[PDB]
Automatic annotation (TrEMBL), chain B:
Source species: Thermus virus P23-45
This protein's name: Thermus phage P23-45 gp39 N-terminal domain-containing protein
Domain Thermus phage P23-45 gp39 N-terminal per the UniProt entry, residue ranges: 10-102
Amino acid sequence: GPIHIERYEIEARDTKLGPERITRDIPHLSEAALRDLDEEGVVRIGAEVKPGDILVGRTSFKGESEPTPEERLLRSIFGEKARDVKDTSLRVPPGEGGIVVRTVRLRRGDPGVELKPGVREVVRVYVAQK
Amino acid sequence: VEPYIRLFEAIPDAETELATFYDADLDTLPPRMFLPSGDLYTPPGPVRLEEIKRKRRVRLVKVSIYRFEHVGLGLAARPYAYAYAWQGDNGILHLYHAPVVLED
C-alpha cells in the first residue's frame, strides 16, 4: 500500500490594489480555525488537516466596489491604513486531507531564490493522505 | 491573564523578521476585532493596548475598550471594557473571550 503525498502551493503576489501577504492575522476566523497555524500562518508539521482547513494563511486587499460607502469615506478621511483586508487563504480541497509532513517557504530577494514575476513569497505544504 | 499567556505561547514559533505592531490609541481608529468564534466585535469607542508578551509576528495584548461621554467636565474617554487578545501583523485583534464590561 503506497502512501499518497500531495503538494499544496500558494503565492503572495504584488497587486494593483496592494500586496497579498502570507500571515496568521486573518479576519473572521475562529480560534479553532487558527489553532494549528504557526506564527507565520503556515500550518504546523504533524497536524491533521481536513477539507476546508487552512494550510497557509493569506490576506489580500479588497476590490474597489467591495467596501460599503461608509468604508469608502473612512479610507478617504483616515488614509490608506484604514483598509480592510480579506481572507484569501490556502484551504484543503474537498475529498482530501491527511497529516502535514513538510513545509517549504521562500521569500523574494533571499539569496539564491528566484520566484515568478510579481511573487513576493511562496509556501508549499506536503500532506500524507489518509 | 495567565491562561492567556498559556494560549499565546502555544502558538508555534518560526524564524522570521520581527513585525512592527499597530499601537492603537484613543487618538486612532481601533483595528478590527474578532471574538474566538470568528464573529466581528464592534467596540463603542477606541481602544488602547498593553503588550504582555511577543513573538516575531504575533503579540499578546490587554485591550482596553473605551467609550466617550459628555460628563460634568466636558468630553471624556472613559473605560468601558477589557479583553485579552493576540494581535497579528495586519494589526487585527483576536479576542480570547468576549470583553468584560466594567462596572460603574
